[PDB]
Amino acid sequence: HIHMGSKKKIRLYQFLLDLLRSGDMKDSIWWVDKDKGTFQFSSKHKEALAHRWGIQKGNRKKMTYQKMARALRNYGKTGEVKKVKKKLTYQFSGEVLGRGGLAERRLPPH
Numbered sequence: 001h002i003h004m005g006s007k008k009k010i011r012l013y014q015f016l017l018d019l020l021r022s023g024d025m026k027d028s029i030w031w032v033d034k035d036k037g038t039f040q041f042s043s044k045h046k047e048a049l050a051h052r053w054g055i056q057k058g059n060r061k062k063m064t065y066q067k068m069a070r071a072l073r074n075y076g077k078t079g080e081v082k083k084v085k086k087k088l089t090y091q092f093s094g095e096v097l098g099r100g101g102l103a104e105r106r107l108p109p110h
Helices: 012-021 046-057 065-077 094-098
Strands: 029-033 038-041 081-083 089-092
16 A cells, blocks of 8 residues: 555564554554563454554455464474463564564465
């Protein structure tokens, strides 16, 4: 939405870290712990956050909490975003906390 001067690529882990730092109010995702880098997802707003991204992507395809969770969990083996024993809590690695932006790299479908 809204025509842009240049094209950009983002993907799921980038969006949730960017969400807080965007200048929008941190209602859907908030910080647990500034040094640990645990972030807490708000229980009420899980569908709304996923729906906003889904309608940002387009009319045709839905995106929902499960669909996001299956994709989000899959980062854990690489270790960029790590799960906690509380499902709605993840913590983020040094590289993702340190640097934010855009990149293009190939990946298989989920």
